[PDB]
Design a protein around this ligand. Structure first.
Ligand SMILES: Nc1ncnc2c1ncn2[C@@H]1O[C@H](CO)[C@@H](O)[C@H]1O
Length: 269
């Protein structure tokens, strides 16, 4: 009877993922997030038959704080209720970039690095997010830690080809736009490339399908040669020409990353 262990609060947000309410867990007054999803609105299920999002979060919710952990969940007549952690204060990368504009490379380095550790975490756990982007990245302003959210478009990690994709088009790779097919790890790397550009330029690089398939990336902001190189590498047109997570984390631009707390005092506090 979820309607007792938690006390609902204001509506944090809503959209193509459901409706999320701020809440508190009467038992330790733990700040939580309560997400509602209508059964009629989901297409992927796994296992009892629960929405894929729950299966994904469960395999990924133990320990490492790179992803928002799923604390619990309940089933209702026509929907599922998810109890997620809720850091405070917090701000998603989209709003953060929208307010501060392009990020200094030291900050983008720390942020990108943490996203990479989080993505490696999910992959290691057999989960592919499929919708990595600013909006799905939460920033814990006080600890300087980022956390991944909304695995609603995710899928179990597999080595074979994918033929479905309901993520964010502007963050989709050329192979999806042209052949309606892609592979997990390399598609993920491509979106990682869009994200990085978004961070240091303050906006995504491609708007139209033609631009995505063209691959030419123009910089509207001043960014180091090393950063431009990593970005271009992640955005290689041919999937196999993209770097592996290891190659990204070993890239020259990725060295000397700040620690989360250091990031918070220098850039967030
Ligand atoms: N687990 C969560 N904890 C805190 N806030 C969240 C969580 N999931 C979604 N949100 C809020 O809802 C918005 C929807 O993208 C996010 O920007 C964030 O503000």
């Amino acid at each position: 009877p979820l309607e007792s262990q938690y006390q609902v609060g204001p509506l944090l947000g809503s959209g193509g993922f459901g409706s999320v309410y701020s809440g508190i867990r009467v038992s330790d007054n733990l700040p939580v997030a309560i997400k509602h999803v209508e059964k009629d609105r989901i297409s992927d299920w796994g296992e009892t038959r629960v929405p894929m999002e729950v299966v994904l979060l469960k395999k990924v919710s133990s320990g490492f704080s790179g992803v928002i952990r799923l604390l619990d969940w309940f089933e209702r007549p026509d929907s599922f209720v998810l109890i997620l952690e809720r850091p405070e204060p917090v701000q998603d990368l989209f709003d953060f970039i929208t307010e501060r504009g392009a990020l200094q490379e030291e900050l983008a380095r720390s942020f990108f690095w943490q996203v990479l550790e989080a993505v490696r975490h999910c992959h290691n756990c057999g989960v592919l997010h499929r919708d990595i982007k600013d909006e799905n990245i939460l920033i814990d302003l006080n600890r300087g830690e980022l956390k991944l959210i909304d695995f609603g478009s995710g899928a179990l990690l597999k080595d074979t080809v994918y033929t479905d994709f309901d993520g964010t088009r502007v963050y989709s790779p050329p192979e999806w736009i042209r052949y309606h097919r892609y592979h997990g790890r390399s598609a993920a790397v491509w979106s990682l490339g869009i994200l990085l550009y978004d961070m240091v330029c303050g906006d995504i690089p491609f708007e139209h399908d033609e631009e995505i398939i063209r691959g030419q990336v123009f910089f509207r902001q001043r960014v180091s040669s090393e950063c431009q190189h990593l970005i271009r590498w992640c955005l290689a047109l041919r999937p196999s020409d993209r770097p592996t997570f290891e190659e990204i984390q070993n890239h020259p631009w990725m060295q000397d990353v700040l620690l989360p707390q250091e990031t918070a005092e220098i850039h967030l506090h």
